[model samples]
Target: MVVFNGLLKIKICEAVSLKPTAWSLRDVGPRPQTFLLDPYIALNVDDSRIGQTATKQKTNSPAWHDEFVTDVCNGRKIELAVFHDAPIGYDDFVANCTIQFEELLQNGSRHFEDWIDLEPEGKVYVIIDLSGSSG
Candidate 1:
């Protein structure tokens, strides 16, 4: 199998909603809301040959993967999870893999480009993965 080494860049943002569903109603009217929870990240790996694998990563501080939730009343938090899939191939061989992100309710559509490298002295597979939500 081919081993690859590269850096992955990720960005996270807060998603706010102004709809009535996001706010609380007191006496059948709009009222002030409070959001005290933070956003989280979910990692998904999909290959042309191996199918898909998904996992949730902790989003507290800055790292390879992170999510930031801010203070806002009647606002929602959006967590963007970004990472690279490991190298995949047969023994001492290299192949191409397609990476993608799952659809989220708060976030719009997202996708990753298919990458393939066959150089003996260069990186095989690398990706800058990202996921976020907006409401």
Candidate 2:
């Protein structure tokens, strides 16, 4: 996922666990790497729809931001991918993201919104890869 001006970025891929007594024991590999998506953005604003709560007021120009990915096996669960952007039709501005994966650790929240007429500041950027895994 990639977003600018409203802030949002995320990337995650690496999870293979198809438990069946862990393949009858003898394949306890791959399960030390973590993080599937850690980008940040969340602007619900009480339910959106050009909503305001007295901050700086005036909003416009911010139409994209959201990213998420997930995959886990063996531990118990599988498959999930979401990435959004490219919707600048002006409907009070909008952006959203929310994901959570336990044990493996992959929490989330990416949201952005502003549209009262045109006057909302913006800034966001995120990228992570702690490096770990080689086989």
Candidate 3:
């Protein structure tokens, strides 16, 4: 068995065809009835938020090209979620996808490029690169 230990780097490339879904916002004051969204990406590991990207304003299809690095272990799972940053209330969930760390071990140097399908409407492009040693 291969045990991977060390850092995992993730690049959030872009997203497309992400339609706006109806979400409730409490204490609405001067909220515009617009269709465009303020979208951002969040990375979750072990059910905890590890990192997040900057929110893009007034766009459904966004290109972030942002990268985040985190420590990871073998067999661990990582979740990528896209959210709409609300103007007044809490953030809204746009789409989400999850993948295991072991799944990327097939390639040389353990580098993987993924085009993940979001839950509701769209798809996202990402690059996963592992820099570590296996035992």
Against the hidden reference, what TM-scores do the models get? 0.20, 0.16, 0.83
Q: Each candidate's lDDT (Cα)? A: 0.24, 0.23, 0.81
Report the candidate with higher TM-score, 1 versus 3.
3
Specify the highest-TM-score model's number. 3
lDDT, candidate 3, 1-135, per-residue tens: 555688989999999887776672332446576477789999997577889988998888899999998887653667889998987767888888887666666567668896899888799999988888666
Q: What ranges in model 2 sit over 4 Å off?
A: 1-29, 36-38, 49-135
Ranking by TM-score: 3, 1, 2
Question: What is candidate 3's CA lDDT for residue 129?
Answer: 86
User: Candidate 1 — worst ten consecutive residues by lDDT sum?
Assistant: 18-27
Candidate 2, residue 62: how far the Cα is off, in Å: 20
What is the lDDT ranking, best to worst? 3, 1, 2
Q: Clashing pairs in model 3?
A: none
Clashing pairs in 1: 1-91, 1-92, 16-135
What is the number of backbone collisions in each predicted candidate, taken in the order shown?
A: 3, 11, 0
> Higher-lDDT candidate among 2 and 3?
3
1-135 per-residue lDDT for model 1 (tens digits): 111122223232211221111221111325464322122223222211211123222221212223222222222222222222223431111112222222212143332323232222111222333333323
